[PDB]
Ligand binder design. Structure first.
Ligand code: PIO
Ligand code: PIO
Ligand code: CLR
Ligand code: NAG
Lengths: 359, 40, 182
C-alpha cells in the first residue's frame, strides 16, 4: 500500500478500492459484545482527554476555543472518519503538541495584535492545499522509510509521557489538598474548592489504585482458566466498564468526601460569545485581517501538517502491523487526506484540528 | 455572528467560495504543470 | 469515618477521642502498599530478573524490605496520625494492686477455697485439649513429607515442653501459650 504508483491521486484510489469493498463486513462484524465494550472503553478514553484539553485551551486562549468546540469537532471528525476512513480503528482527538502549538500561536497573535481565530482559519485553508498537494503526488509513500526502530521509539516515548502525565495529575491533586493536621471546614465549593479539603487526595489515590487493580485482575481473568469460556470472555471484554462502574459506585456511596468529577458545558454553545461565533469571517471579526498574515500562515500550517502527518502515519503503522493480524488493509493516503481536510474545515468554524492519537 | 462584527464587502459564504475557487485554480495549475513535466 | 468536617482540637493522649482526617484512608493505603510490595517481592523471588544470588537475597528479605519501605513512607507524613505499636515502659506487672511477680497458691487477698483446687481440673482439661489439638495439628501441618522435612519432629517432647512451660508460667502469673498455626 506504500508503493508509488506514479499516477495522480493513485494512492487514494488504491486505498478506496482496497477498503470500500469491505464496507458491508464493517457493519456485520460489529455484532459482538466485545465491540460494545470497546465502545464504552474508547468513549471515556477519548472524552476525558478532550475535556481536559478543552479546559486547558480555554484557560490559555481566553476561552476562544474551549470544551464545547473541541467536543463538537471531535464528534464530527470521528463520525466522518468512521463513515469514510480506511482505518476506522484510529481514534481522532486532540493531543498535547497541538495544545503547545495553539498556545504558541495565541502568544504570537497577542504580541502582534492579530485575531488568533482568523489566523487559525487561514492556517486550515493552507492545510487543505498542502494535503491536497501531498495526496496528489502520493507524498505518503515516504512512510515506508519509517522502520520498526522509529515506530517503537515513538510508541515507547508516548506511553512514558502518558504514564508520567497520569501520575503528575495525581501529584497535582495531592498538592491541591495536602495532608494537614487541621483544615478549614468552611470553604467555598463553587466553582472549585479554594482551600485544602480532608480525605480528598487519599480517596483519589485509593480510587485510582482500585481502578487499576480491578482492570489488571479482569485482564488476567480474561486469560485465566476460571469460569466457562464464553462467560469468561464476556467478563474479560467488559473488564474496563465493570471496573469503572464498581469504582463509580464505591465513590457514590461516600457522600461526605469530595472528589473531582467530569465537567461538561451546559449546552451546545461557543465558549466565549464576545470573542467569536459559530462561523468566523476570514476577513476579520473585529478588525480587518492583514494581507501579509494570510500568506505568512503557511509556515505554521506547515508545522501543523508535519505534526499531524507524523502522528497519524506512525499510529497507522503501529495499528496495522502484520503481526497484529490485520487482514482488511489500511489506507494511509485516504486517512491523511480526511484528517487534514476535516481539520481545515473545522478551522473555519472555530474548532480545533485533530490527529490520530497513538494511545 | 455574535456581538458586533466589522462589515465586509464579501460575506462569509462569498469569501469562502472565493478562497476555495482560488485554491482550486492553484491546484489545477500545479497539476497541469506537473503533467507537463516528465513528458518532454 | 469519612466526614465533611472534623474538630481540629481533639486530645491525643492516650488515644484520640474523636475522628481525625486522613487517618483511615492512609491506613488503608499503607496496608494495600505493604501487601502489594510483599506480593511483588514474592513474585520477584520466583521471577527471572536480576542475578540469581541477588534475586534470592532480595526475595528472602521481601517482607523486611516492604515493612521498611512502608514505615519510611509513613515516617515522612508527619501531619497525619496513624496508630503505632504500644509497649510497656519497663518490665513490670500490669496491675501492681492485683498481684506481683509470684502469686501465692493459697491466696493473695483472701484464703483460697479448698473445693476450687480440685474443681480446677475441668478447666485445665479444656485448656489441655485446646493446646494439644492446636500444637499437634500445627506439627502435622509443618512436618508433612511433601514439605521436605528431613530432620524429624517430636510430638511428645514438644507437647510436654509446651504444657509444662504453660503450667510454670501460670505460677508466675503469666498466660499459657500454644503452637499457633499461622
Ligand atoms: C453461573 C454459571 C453457570 C452456573 C451453573 C453451573 C453448571 C455449569 O456451569 O456447568 C456447565 C458448564 C460445563 O460445561 P463444559 O465443562 O463442557 O464447558 C467447557 C468450558 O466452557 C470451557 O471453558 C470450554 O473451553 P474453552 O474456554 O473454549 O477453551 C469448553 O469448550 P472446549 O474448548 O473444550 O470445546 C467447554 O466444553 O460449566 C463449565 O463450563 C465448567 C466451569 C463451571 C464453573 C462454575 C460456574 C461458574
Ligand atoms: C547490580 C548488579 C551488577 C551490575 C553489574 C553488571 C554486570 C553483571 O551483572 O554481569 C554479571 C552477571 C553475569 O553473569 P551470569 O550471566 O553468568 O550469571 C548467571 C545468573 O546469575 C543466573 O541467574 C544464574 O542462574 P540461576 O539464577 O541460578 O538459575 C546463572 O547460574 P547457572 O544456573 O546458569 O549455573 C549465572 O551464571 O550478571 C547476570 O547475572 C546477568 C543479569 C544481569 C542483569 C543486569 C544487572 C542487574
Ligand atoms: C492557500 C489558499 C487559501 C489560497 C492562497 C491565498 C491567496 C493567494 C489568496 C486567497 C484569498 C485571497 C483574498 C481574497 C479576497 C480579498 C479581498 C480583496 O479586497 C483584497 C484581496 C484579498 C484579501 C485576497 C488576497 C489574496 C488571497 C488571500
Ligand atoms: C472572552 O473574551 C474577552 C475579551 O474579548 C475576555 O475579556 C473574557 O475574559 C473572555 N471570557 C472568558 C470566560 O475568559
Amino acid at each position: 500500500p506504500l508503493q508509488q504508483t506514479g499516477q495522480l491521486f493513485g494512492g487514494l484510489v488504491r486505498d478506496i478500492r482496497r477498503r470500500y469493498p469491505y464496507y458491508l463486513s464493517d457493519i456485520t462484524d460489529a455484532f459482538s459484545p466485545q465491540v460494545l465494550a470497546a465502545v464504552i472503553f474508547i468513549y471515556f478514553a477519548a472524552l476525558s482527554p478532550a475535556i481536559t484539553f478543552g479546559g486547558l485551551l480555554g484557560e490559555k486562549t481566553r476561552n476562544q476555543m474551549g470544551v464545547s468546540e473541541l467536543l463538537i469537532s471531535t464528534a464530527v471528525q470521528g463520525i466522518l472518519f468512521a463513515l469514510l476512513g480506511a482505518q476506522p480503528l484510529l481514534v481522532v482527538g486532540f493531543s498535547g503538541p497541538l495544545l503547545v502549538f495553539e498556545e504558541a500561536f495565541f502568544s504570537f497573535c497577542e504580541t502582534n495584535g492579530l485575531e488568533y481565530i482568523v489566523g487559525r482559519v487561514w492556517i486550515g485553508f493552507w492545510l487543505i492545499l498542502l494535503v491536497v498537494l501531498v495526496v496528489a503526488f502520493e507524498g505518503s509513500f515516504l512512510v515506508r522509510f519509517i522502520s520498526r526502530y522509529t515506530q517503537e521509539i515513538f510508541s515507547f516515548l508516548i506511553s512514558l509521557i502518558f504514564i508520567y502525565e497520569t501520575f503528575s495529575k495525581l501529584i497535582k491533586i495531592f498538592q491541591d489538598h495536602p495532608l494537614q493536621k487541621t483544615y478549614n471546614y468552611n470553604v467555598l465549593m463553587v466553582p472549585k474548592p479554594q482551600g485544602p479539603l480532608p480525605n480528598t487526595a487519599l480517596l483519589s489515590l485509593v480510587l485510582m489504585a482500585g481502578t487499576f487493580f480491578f482492570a489488571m485482575m479482569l485482564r488476567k481473568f480474561k486469560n485465566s482458566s476460571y469460569f466457562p469460556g464464553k462467560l469468561r470472555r464476556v467478563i474479560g471484554d467488559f473488564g474496563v466498564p465493570i471496573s469503572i462502574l464498581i469504582m463509580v459506585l464505591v465513590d457514590f456511596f461516600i457522600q461526605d468526601t469530595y472528589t473531582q468529577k467530569l465537567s461538561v458545558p451546559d449546552g451546545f454553545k461557543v465558549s466565549n460569545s464576545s470573542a467569536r461565533g459559530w462561523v468566523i469571517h476570514p476577513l476579520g471579526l473585529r478588525s480587518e485581517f492583514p494581507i501579509w498574515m494570510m500568506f505568512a500562515s503557511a509556515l505554521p500550517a506547515l508545522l501543523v501538517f508535519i505534526l499531524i502527518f507524523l502522528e497519524s502515519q506512525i499510529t497507522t503503522l503501529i495499528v496495522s502491523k502484520p503481526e497484529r493480524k490485520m487482514v482488511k488493509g489500511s489506507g494511509f493516503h485516504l486517512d491523511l487526506l480526511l484528517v487534514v481536510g476535516m481539520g481545515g474545515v473545522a478551522a473555519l468554524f472555530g474548532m480545533p484540528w485533530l490527529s490520530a492519537t497513538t494511545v | 455572528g455574535e456581538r458586533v462584527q466589522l462589515a465586509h464587502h464579501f460575506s462569509e459564504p462569498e469569501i469562502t467560495l472565493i478562497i476555495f475557487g482560488v485554491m482550486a485554480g492553484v491546484i489545477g495549475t500545479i497539476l497541469l504543470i506537473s503533467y507537463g513535466i516528465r513528458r518532454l
